Design a protein around this ligand. Sequence first.
Ligand code: 3PE
Ligand code: DGT
Ligand code: MG
Lengths: 140, 55, 70, 98, 347, 49, 88, 99, 120, 320
Amino acid sequence: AKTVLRQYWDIPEGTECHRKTYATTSIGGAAGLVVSAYSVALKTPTSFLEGVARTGRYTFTAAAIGAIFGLTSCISAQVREKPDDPLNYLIGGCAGGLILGARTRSYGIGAAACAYMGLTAALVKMGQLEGWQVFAEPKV
Amino acid sequence: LLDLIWLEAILPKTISLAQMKASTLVTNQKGLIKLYFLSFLITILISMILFNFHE
Amino acid sequence: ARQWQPDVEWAEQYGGAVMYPTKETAHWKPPPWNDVDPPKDTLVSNLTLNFGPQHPAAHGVLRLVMELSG
Amino acid sequence: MSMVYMNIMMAFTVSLVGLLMYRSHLMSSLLCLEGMMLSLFVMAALTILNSHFTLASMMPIILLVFAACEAALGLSLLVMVSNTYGTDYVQNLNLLQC
Amino acid sequence: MNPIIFIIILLTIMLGTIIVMISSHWLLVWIGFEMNMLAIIPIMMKNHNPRATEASTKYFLTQSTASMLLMMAVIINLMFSGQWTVMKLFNPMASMLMTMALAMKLGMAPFHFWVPEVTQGIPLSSGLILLTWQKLAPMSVLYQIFPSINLNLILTLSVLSILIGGWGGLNQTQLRKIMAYSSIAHMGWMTAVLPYNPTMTLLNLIIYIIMTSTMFTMFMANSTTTTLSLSHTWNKTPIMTVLILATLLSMGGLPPLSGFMPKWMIIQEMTKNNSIILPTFMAITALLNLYFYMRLTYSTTLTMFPSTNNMKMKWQFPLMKKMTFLPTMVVLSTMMLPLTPMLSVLE
Amino acid sequence: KFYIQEPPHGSPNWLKVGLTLGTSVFLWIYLIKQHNEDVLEYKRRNGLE
Amino acid sequence: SDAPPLTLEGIKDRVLYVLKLYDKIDPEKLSVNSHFMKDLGLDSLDQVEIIMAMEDEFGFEIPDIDAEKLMCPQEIVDYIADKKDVYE
Amino acid sequence: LRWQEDPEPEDENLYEKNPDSHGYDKDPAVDIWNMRVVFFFGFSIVLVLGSTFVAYLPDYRMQEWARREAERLVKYREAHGLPIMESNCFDPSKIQLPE
Amino acid sequence: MMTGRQGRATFQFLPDEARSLPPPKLTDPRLAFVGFLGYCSGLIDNAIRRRPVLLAGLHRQLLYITSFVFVGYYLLKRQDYMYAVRDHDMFSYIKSHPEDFPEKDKKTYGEVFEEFHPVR
Amino acid sequence: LQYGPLAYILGEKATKKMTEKSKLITVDGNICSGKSKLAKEIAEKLGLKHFPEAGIHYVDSTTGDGKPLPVQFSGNCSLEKFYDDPKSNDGNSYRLQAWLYASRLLQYADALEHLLSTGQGVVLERSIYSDFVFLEAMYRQGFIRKQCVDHYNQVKKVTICEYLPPHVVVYVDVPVPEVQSRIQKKGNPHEMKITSAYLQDIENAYKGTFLPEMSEKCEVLQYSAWEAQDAEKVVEDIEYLKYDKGPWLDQNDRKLHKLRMLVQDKLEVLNYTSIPVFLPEVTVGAHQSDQVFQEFTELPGRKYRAGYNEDVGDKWIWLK
Ligand SMILES: CCCCCCCCCCCCCCCCCC(=O)OC[C@H](COP(=O)(O)OCCN)OC(=O)CCCCCCCCCCCCCCCCC
Ligand SMILES: Nc1nc2c(ncn2[C@H]2C[C@H](O)[C@@H](COP(=O)(O)OP(=O)(O)OP(=O)(O)O)O2)c(=O)[nH]1
Ligand SMILES: [Mg+2]
């Protein structure tokens, strides 16, 4: 899961939308697969088809969010010529949050997800600009 | 509209109810040894296939 | 102006198996007060064996039906 | 690592995956635990013998000793499991967290 | 169980733990774990009821599986270094196996499912040995191999424990599962700071042991294993209700109580290494722990729940249980914050 | 007598009371000797006296 | 989840369906009010076998004293309701 | 009924039994002492002596000194024809501009 | 970090070099607080066992205080020793690495240019 | 040394004091059947310790000065009020029965503790094993609701399994009309309002559920009214019993240690008598509960643990 991220931060921001969309869709799909791995194992389905049916629903939902987010944030930096702007990710994140509302069929979940994904996506871009660290190597 | 509903709705009420749901999932287990250990196999594969922790 | 203190209805909230009942955990029952569950009913039957009539020790004409535990 | 190490480590994984995936019998999953001990025993014996680590030659022997203190312990619970229910099915051990 | 047999079995559990702590050989460390696991099962099945059997069966399977992984890591390390010393491992694959093995014995998520279950099926005294003394050995091995532990692996488990631990306990009414999930969340704080400063790992482990031991002792005094059962204590031992309040508040990390010290010192170390986001996430996520500690106080000390008529018969008898070390432990678990700089003695 | 039974604590356990007071006296004596000894060796090594 | 509740209309289908499988009752003239003996012509033992099927259908024991009175499909539906408390 | 519980008590009226009550306590002896300590230490000590203490604080925050100090400088800097206030608060001779 | 402090002396509570430090004075505020904790334990012990808190078992309470102070005193000796070691290692390292800790060149505020931001 | 693991290891076993005469005898029988006097005689002739039947104020006799405490500190349940209004709306019937069961449980624990520690036998008048007979009569006479019976079984089902049954069960049988006869000339007017059916239900439960089940685990002796008159006959039957059944044959030092450690601790005995099952008959409000408990704690010699109450002449507190 390191290579895919590297392929996403090694592309100039706001350009080559198709390449960035593939990366985000892959990352989104991987997240939906892990969710479906545990869901299948912990809550055993009542038939083989109901298991792949469950996995398809979860993987598709996570790939839809990954695709829209990568697509929306890539053009917004293309249209505005503002590559280093966390606002582009904010638009992208809330766009992904909206889809989660659509596929779950709940406006509240779509509303809540837009804000929390939108804020989460923006903070991701800020840290890349500022060089924040989530897992900081020991230094002192 | 503002004090009793929308200020309650966004910060306190939603942050609370998300925890309630997240708690039922992590505790909606049936104590079946068969299902837990299958989860360990998933974690071990994930730690390598995706995250390359073995490296 | 006696201050309100939890009544029976309030306490019942904390008597269930779980705090937040769902579709699944509706049927969960509280564990036994002393942790001992009732023993189960008839489970295992003794093996039944024909000790005859064609047996060296059955004298030829003794069908001795036995129930063995081991 | 010679081609033999592949099979012994391949054998250990097969036992490990076998253990984590219970079918119905508890005795079937106790053998996999004993199977893993045999893999580790062999793998240690090849490593120690090959390098002439003389004093380490006692390690595999000590390994078997606690390999059986689990089997003895594991069978002890199996007796107590079947007494309560009459069979060693794992689906009967669902009183806790349910 | 014959009283002589209980002591000898107990002395074997400590010997198994002590062997792991003083050993300088990967073989003995494994023997220590096996000896500890051998003599812990009988204490679980000291009453012989179906729930004790299930707990012992689930506990044996998890630890034995963990031991196979720990021995496998020891053999791979032997191949790639040709030595048995209990020090940093000499292969990335062995470190992953040992880290997961130790995480399985500690109960850190996602290998956590057994901890709520084993504790619920064993007596209160047995649970005290399971949630306090059984962390000393798995922790003394992480203390010696932390340089080689992968950074991303260890922190991921800690972030999962603090989340799984916090959410799990929200839904529980049994006291033996509230403490089971409280244990999991606290493992997250211990292992989160291990890469940065192992000394703070010991401090978080010592405070956890005292507060946990104090909680179990007060539960055993009244023989209470449910939330409601603990609600009648105000009608028997009112002094016992207040001590539970103070200890529970401390376990939540509220100042100026001892349970704030390990959290306070953990945040310092992580920040000094430029880790700002993770301590913030851990600190906020710990509010989940404080919430379901506050429900116990509401039902136990801050309000008077309905009682029963037969409760009047208990007023006439003294509390005859030992409650060993309880007066000392309660003080150490609430009034140690002014002596924070004493943590240097742990180094 | 008031109580119908003899309370287990009807009278002091003078063995306990003797040991309790003995330990307290011993430790204070041991500690006070310890501090005095520590002070002397502290001056001896630092050379101030 | 909690299973769907038993309703008097649900029981009715079960009884008639069970009677429908029976090979001695003609499906044409089996009404919810038809009588086993007089209308359908079944003999005593034929009646006893039907009651046995109902025990398999709903999985509970019916004493012989009660089955002596279940002479038409209606009271069967009533009896099942009384046992499961399906007032509906 | 749903449980055994005492009925609702009815609020005591202190004037019911003690027509001269100050409301501090049901004991006329103690009640009178509660009033006295509140009135003495409150109205006679804190408010009166405390108010007098504030009124005679020794030049709270050198407000009086600064007045007499400004008079001397204006007195001093007008006899010598100097400006009352110099537009610079620091000596330029000891400042190094960045360039 | 100081676990392997290049001194051997492993598994010793107070190494012999620790005798070169001034022992804690018995009037230490730290030690008095530790003793006060002992007294609080004694009162708690009486309370949970339903005895007159301030009076029952004076012999017992005297033992709580003394035991707490006895152990407390030795922890202060080791608490102060470890910190003394921390500075000893910190300074010698600085002395052994002049280049990594260079003496700074200090300028007065009449030469240091600081941006000014009005508040209006 | 207060009994515990150390005293046991030091060599204080139960078999070292148990003898073939250390027996636990229990005299049952319907109301006004002479069990009260008969059990008094069996103890003296065989030299056992006699335990009067555990009424409402049994626990009081075991603690403090032994004088009964006021009624409110015993649940307020009134035996006579049960006779006056057995179908009252304040649930006096079950609170009385629920209270009584705890009294018998506490008494039975007292009996076993004496038997194991001292080795002398003991004679009881009814016990936790025969207490359900009255509950059975109340339910069939419409005095206690169905939910009350379910509560009783749960409390019973988690406590009665920890104790061994009695050695000998002496049942004194008296026909219901005779009981009605022996009550009329008995004095107390409240008992005179007992209906016959109530005694019949006790009789039906006693013989049919209790006596059948005790025989397969205890040595049951049945005596008529006239036979019960002379205790010498009964004392002869008891002394020639064989004692060849029941769980008392397979108890050794290890198992009696577990039992003895339970009955000396009276709070562990009464643990489940107060399970948090909110039945209206036994539930108590917080305000009422707080009030009574503060009154109890100010009774003479109740403020502190026994032996530390200064007002009742205790001394040496500051060294104790
Ligand atoms: C910067 C570099 C690029 C980084 C990659 C960017 C792309 C990120 C891709 C995001 C993928 C989201 C993963 C969410 C998994 C959701 C799994 C799922 O589909 O099920 C969720 C559930 C619906 O399941 P349900 O219908 O209830 O099942 C049947 C039950 N009867 O519905 C629910 O229960 C709602 C709960 C799901 C919400 C999970 C929490 C949000 C996920 C974290 C996203 C945060 C970041 C997103 C923005 C991107 C940040 C850069
Ligand atoms: N409701 C109820 N009353 C009980 C219970 N046990 C005793 N009583 C009451 C019934 C009687 O009024 C009283 C005593 O009953 P007895 O059996 O001892 O009859 P009595 O003493 O009058 O004569 P006797 O024992 O035969 O010599 O106590 C009980 O478990 N429930
Ligand atoms: Mg009588």
